[PDB]
Amino acid sequence: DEALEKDLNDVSKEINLMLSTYAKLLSERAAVDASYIDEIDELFKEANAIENALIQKREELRQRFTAIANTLHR
Amino acid sequence: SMGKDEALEKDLNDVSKEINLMLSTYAKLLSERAAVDASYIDEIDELFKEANAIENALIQKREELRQRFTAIANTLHR
Amino acid sequence: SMGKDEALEKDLNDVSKEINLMLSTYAKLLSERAAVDASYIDEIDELFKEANAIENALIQKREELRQRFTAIANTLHR
Amino acid sequence: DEALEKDLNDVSKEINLMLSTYAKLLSERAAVDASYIDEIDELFKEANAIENALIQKREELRQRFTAIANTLHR
Ligand SMILES: [Ca+2]
Ligand SMILES: [Ca+2]
Ligand SMILES: [Ca+2]
Ligand SMILES: [Ca+2]
Ligand SMILES: [Ca+2]
Ligand SMILES: [Ca+2]
Ligand SMILES: [Ca+2]
Ligand SMILES: [Ca+2]
Ligand SMILES: [Ca+2]
Ligand SMILES: [Ca+2]
Ligand SMILES: [Ca+2]
Ligand SMILES: [Ca+2]
Ligand SMILES: [Ca+2]
Ligand SMILES: [Ca+2]
């Protein structure tokens, strides 16, 4: 019911809106990826600190067990 | 009482659960991105096809006006 | 070695963190619902207004056809 | 460029699609709410079991401390 010229201008506006919206969404992905990488890195560092402490504690237990055994069996 | 080794094992499991949840949340975000990307392509394709059809009809409309004014000019001379 | 009381305190904190995350995820889902509800109202309103305008124009179109056929009938008798 | 009758039928289809889609979304909220309530309930029960065990352990520590004190100060 509107002229073809008017309808062409309406659809062009729809295109520009979708393009501008998607461009924005795409431009934001890098910072989101960077945030996940940063936070996963923090968690892996936390896990590695716990794991390392567990390794140390297990070696101390090995040494305590060996010492008690040697004292008891001579 | 209990061993610190046991407590450290438990704390390592706690952080492993957090890592697994973060990795799975990120994997989900990537799936949502893929579906968004494909939907954009479908939808922008529909819009560009509609725009080109309107554009082609508008070109035809201007030529129809040219033809109709030419026919009037010929009618005036009759 | 360490006390089981300390280990239990730590485990209680671990579950409290999970509760807090679940409560906040649910609070987020409710916010998304509210925005969805309001968007539905905006969008269905636009559609019903468009439908009523088309409907009213169609009623007018049928009456215009009635008027145009009546005028033809009067022209035929001239 | 289409007749008003055709356009009325197109918009009616759009309405029915939006209504049917929203009705579905609304009908699904109860099961989602129920799932959150169920899972939060499981977590609170887990937390209460830990808390209760901590209360018991603290009372045992109170009794061990009192007994050692009495033995040492007579
Ligand atoms: Ca038109
Ligand atoms: Ca238009
Ligand atoms: Ca390590
Ligand atoms: Ca813990
Ligand atoms: Ca398609
Ligand atoms: Ca499509
Ligand atoms: Ca073209
Ligand atoms: Ca824990
Ligand atoms: Ca509105
Ligand atoms: Ca609106
Ligand atoms: Ca009406
Ligand atoms: Ca029309
Ligand atoms: Ca139509
Ligand atoms: Ca309790």
Author numbering:
A (entry chain A), D (entry chain A): 50 to 123
B (entry chain B), C (entry chain B): 46 to 123
Question: What's written in the study?
Answer:
Meiosis protein TEX12 is an essential component of the synaptonemal complex (SC), which mediates homologous chromosome synapsis. It is also recruited to centrosomes in meiosis, and aberrantly in certain cancers, leading to centrosome dysfunction. Within the SC, TEX12 forms an intertwined complex with SYCE2 that undergoes fibrous assembly, driven by TEX12’s C-terminal tip. TEX12 undergoes conformational change upon C-terminal tip mutations, indicating that the sequence responsible for driving SYCE2-TEX12 assembly within the SC also controls the oligomeric state and conformation of isolated TEX12.
We obtained two distinct crystal forms of TEX12 FFV. Similar to the dimer interface of the ΔCtip tetramer, the FFV structure contains a central ‘hinge’ characterised by reciprocal salt bridges between R78 and D82 amino-acids. Accordingly, the FFV structure matches the symmetry-related dimer (r.m.s. deviation = 1.11 Å) but not the unique chain dimer (r.m.s. deviation = 4.25 Å) of the ΔCtip structure, hence our designation of the former as the dimer interface. FFV’s Ctip sequences play no role in stabilising the dimeric coiled-coil, and simply emanate from either end of the molecule, where they mediate interactions within the crystal lattice. Ctip sequences arrange molecules in an end-on ‘dimer-of-dimers’ fashion by forming inter-molecular anti-parallel coiled-coils. Further, the hydrophobic surface of each Ctip dimer binds to the free Ctip ends of two additional ‘dimer-of-dimers’, forming Ctip tetramers. Given that TEX12 FFV is a stable tetramer in solution, its dimeric crystal structure likely represents an alternative conformation induced by crystallisation. Specifically, the extensive Ctip interactions of the crystal lattice may be mutually exclusive with interactions required for stabilisation of the solution tetramer. The most fundamental unit is formed by the dimer interface, which involves anti-parallel coiled-coil interactions surrounding a central R78-D82 salt bridge hinge, and is the sole interface within the FFV dimer crystal structure.
